[PDB]
Write a protein that binds this ligand. Structure first.
Ligand code: PUJ
Ligand code: FMN
Ligand code: CL
Length: 432
């Protein structure tokens, strides 16, 4: 299993009148590697990465102020507050040059620090980072829905060849493929020799006409088992009425009951498609409600929805109870939940807040002209970084090597720590 323990002795340092906790392991003479977590996590999100780096390099992972084992003073916990504390933390440890490993709001911290101190950053690994998000349409409404008891997939017709970017657990059961064997491919891989080609044209024509179609079709499991697949597809449109996704709903079994009962099956998958489409904007409207005072604080501070509801929906795989208690630990007291609510209100989406938008633009500009080595991880569908944006950055950023970690949402270290860690370790070998 992926590791659930946290086998690191605590270290502490006084920072602007407040105590911060950090992990500090590995050798001590060379360039240190600084790990910056974001919301709603802590140095715990790095627990299975650091062991890949520790044999060769020093590993420093602080808990942001207000989080983890660090003190919890009375602040607004604005991004500017975290900036002051991290500035002071780095100076308090005496750090000179560093390599950065950064995630979420840790990455706004790391990129903002590098822009102001470029000759001290010898390389940057980043994943799911803070970028200006132009429109709420780019926020994936489907994030974290893999366990919904409904057989459906989402395709992104704007990626080459309309690949699958989401597959519910049910769809894995039906086809016998794992999520890593499904995402990023066109759903036509389920077809085989006895698939009626005239039916495949009916699907191809309808998709080209951006229109719904319902068919029954011969498909194959990963193990070669033929089965009748009764499935319905239909587009989803964004706020401009343009198709940004297709939704597919499949019915379970080799059927063979695809007659008379077919009229009930057809009605069931059509009804499921409509119900999912009806709910998609409410799924996405949750973060918008977070970004409000009276409702957002009742959800996140009074109810703890960010820990109990958003955090598991940022991992494709299920988090165990042990792992959920580690993330719960700093926030058992409702009064300590301020940084959970202020972070999403700082996110630069659709131009607000203007001050954070400007700041992230400034360091994005820096990163585009900086020769510093860059290692970027991304998953499907991701949350902050959709695949298309990962692809764009892989070509825009100089000295950038991009790594696809497989299925992933926001806490990519939790879906595939062994790849992220080993990739970081080989990368570090190629540096100065
Ligand atoms: C730096 C950037 C950070 C990255 C952020 C990552 O973003 C990931 C996606 O964002 C999701 C935002 N949206 C919500 O959080 C949300 C919305 C609605 C619901 C809902 O129930 O309708 C919930 C929600 C729960 C919500 C609250 C819950 N309590 C409060 C008590 F403490 C328990 C429980 C669940 Si629940 C254990 C009954 C639950 C289950 C669920 N199905 C399980 C799986 F099959 C999907 C879906 C939603 C919930 C959650
Ligand atoms: C949302 C969606 C779901 C689909 N699901 C399946 C499926 O489950 N099985 C299948 O054989 N084809 C499925 N397809 C069809 C293929 O992806 C493809 O569009 C079809 O084979 C016609 O295209 P082609 O002639 O270029 O192969 C789906 C298409 C969409 C848009
Ligand atoms: Cl956030």
């Amino acid at each position: 299993e992926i590791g659930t323990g946290f086998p690191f002795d605590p270290h502490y340092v006084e920072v602007l009148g407040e105590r911060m906790h950090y992990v500090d392991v590995g050798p001590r003479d060379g360039t240190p590697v600084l790990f910056l977590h974001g919301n709603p996590t802590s140095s715990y999100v790095w627990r299975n990465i650091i062991p890949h780096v520790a044999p060769t390099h020093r590993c420093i992972a602080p808990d942001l102020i207000g989080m983890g084992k660090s003190d919890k003073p009375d602040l607004g916990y604005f991004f500017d507050d975290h900036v002051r504390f991290m500035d002071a933390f780095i100076e308090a440890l005496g750090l000179e040059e560093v390599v950065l490993v950064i995630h979420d709001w840790g990455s706004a911290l790391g990129f903002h620090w590098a822009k102001r101190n470029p000759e001290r950053v010898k390389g940057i690994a980043f994943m799911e980072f803070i970028r200006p998000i132009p429109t709420w349409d780019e926020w994936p409404w489907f994030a974290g829905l893999e366990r919904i008891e409904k057989n459906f997939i989402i395709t992104d017709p704007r990626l080459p060849d309309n690949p699958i970017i989401f597959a519910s657990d049910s769809f894995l059961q039906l086809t016998e493929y794992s999520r890593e064997e499904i995402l990023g491919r066109n759903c036509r891989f389920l077809q085989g020799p006895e698939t009626d080609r005239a039916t495949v044209r009916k699907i191809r024509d309808a998709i080209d006409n951006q229109t719904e179609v319902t068919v029954q079709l011969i498909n194959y499991t990963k193990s070669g088992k033929k089965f009748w697949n009764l499935f319905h597809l239909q587009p989803m449109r964004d706020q401009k009425g343009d198709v940004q996704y297709f939704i597919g709903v499949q019915l379970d079994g080799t059927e063979h009951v695809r007659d008379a009962a077919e009229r009930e099956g057809v009605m069931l998958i059509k009804k499921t498609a409509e119900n999912i489409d009806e709910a998609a904007p409410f799924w996405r409207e949750t973060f918008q409600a977070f970004r409000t005072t009276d409702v957002g604080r009742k959800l996140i501070i009074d109810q703890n929805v960010f820990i109990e509801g958003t955090l598991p929906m940022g991992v494709v795989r299920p988090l165990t109870e042990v792992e959920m208690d580690h993330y719960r630990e700093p926030f058992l007291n409702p009064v300590d939940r301020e940084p959970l609510w202020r972070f999403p209100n700082e996110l630069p989406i659709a131009g607000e807040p203007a001050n954070i938008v400007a700041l992230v633009e400034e360091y994005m500009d820096w990163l585009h002209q900086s020769p510093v080595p860059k290692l970027l991880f991304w998953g499907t569908p991701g949350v902050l970084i959709p695949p298309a944006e990962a692809a764009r950055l892989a070509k825009s950023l100089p000295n950038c090597k991009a790594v696809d970690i497989g299925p992933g949402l926001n806490l990519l270290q939790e879906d595939n720590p062994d790849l992220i860690g080993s990739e970081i370790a080989r990368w570090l070998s190629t540096l100065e």
